[PDB]
């Protein structure tokens, strides 16, 4: 399992899963990522995300 927003490797028995009505489910590592996901925040503009560290460098 890899966090939908942060892109971090989710440890076992940790994190929450969010299931939307469009049949797509996302699993998150903490409430910090889930809150930013719900605000339509681009993970490529957040410096500490694993996705940002791949696009750059």
């Amino acid at each position: 399992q890899v966090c939908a927003f942060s892109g971090f490797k989710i440890p076992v028995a940790k994190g929450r899963k969010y299931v939307r009505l469009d049949l797509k489910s996302f699993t998150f590592i903490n409430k910090k990522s889930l809150m930013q996901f719900l605000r339509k925040t681009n993970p490529r503009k957040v410096f500490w995300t694993a996705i940002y560290r791949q696009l750059n460098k």
Binding site: F8, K9, P11, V12, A13, K14, I29, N30, K32
Partner: protein
Amino acid sequence: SHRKFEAPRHGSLAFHPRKRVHKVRATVSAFPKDNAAEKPHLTGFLGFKAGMTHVIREVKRTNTKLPKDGVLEPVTIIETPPMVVAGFVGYKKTTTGLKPITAVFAEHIADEFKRRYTKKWYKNTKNQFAVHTEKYNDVKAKSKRERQIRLIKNRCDVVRVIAHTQMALVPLKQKKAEVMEIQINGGSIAEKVDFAVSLLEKQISVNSVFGTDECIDVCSVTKGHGYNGVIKRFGVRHLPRKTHRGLRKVACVGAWHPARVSWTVARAGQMGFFKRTEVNKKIYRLGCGDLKNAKTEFDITEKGITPMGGFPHYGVVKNDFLMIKGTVAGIRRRVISLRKACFPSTTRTAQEQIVLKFIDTSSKYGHSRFQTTTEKKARMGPMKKDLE
């Protein structure tokens, strides 16, 4: 008039009165019933609660709908370094219960055991067991000891070994040891004393007492909370918002005419430092020797049972330990008295084998991600410090 509606009473009267204990260690009020058709063995131990973690375990029970990939369970870690046996006592069955007859002690006694017989050690003369040790080998004293051994074999029915911990092996600041009387359940009283004598000055490990996948009982003192109200002490209903003079109280503390408040009414008072015995506790991992680590047959990383940054408020576990399924009474660093089950559990879940797939050693502070501190440095890679 009768109460309009019925409900179960709040609180349990099986624990009234709720008097807080005085000593941190809790003594088992019983031992498993003796069987005389088995080899003598020890029926108890004593460990210090370190903390709690969670493990993923594989279900071995049949006819159950639990997931095949593993079930998440909480486990308590109880560090149990080896004990030192420093004497034994015989008990006799009289018409006023057990009465100790004699207590034969070893020749050499550790300073940890001596501290129990004083209150201001740093001012004491520290001459405990001095006369006992200096005259141990005299014929007058040797003859007396042989009489004490012979007295127990003739007029005693219960033998218990006086074993104490070694506080140098634990991160606690206390130096005085914790003394526990562990009964010997086994053959005739003749070979119980023979078995007891062989144990003098020797060290006993927790593996010699408890086996693998064994259900046990735990006796300890619960976490203290001080003075408390009836809502937390007894769980009564909170009064409506409109109430004059406060919400969190029992409205009626008795009828008019028993003319006195009954002992059964919920009253405010002390909650906390109470002695509780919990039965039927499964042992998951017997952390002795090979199983002293946190690795599993599935997750093969060599990691210590201590999480990153140590157990909160406890430190680092570096001795033998036990994994207990679930929660035990008492906060970290509390002394835990262990004992074999008085009524063994024959349920299919109690006899079930335990096979762990994963043990969580991530940090217990915050929302941690990594298991070992090496794999944290691997994922994050080099940082500004160290590289500059």
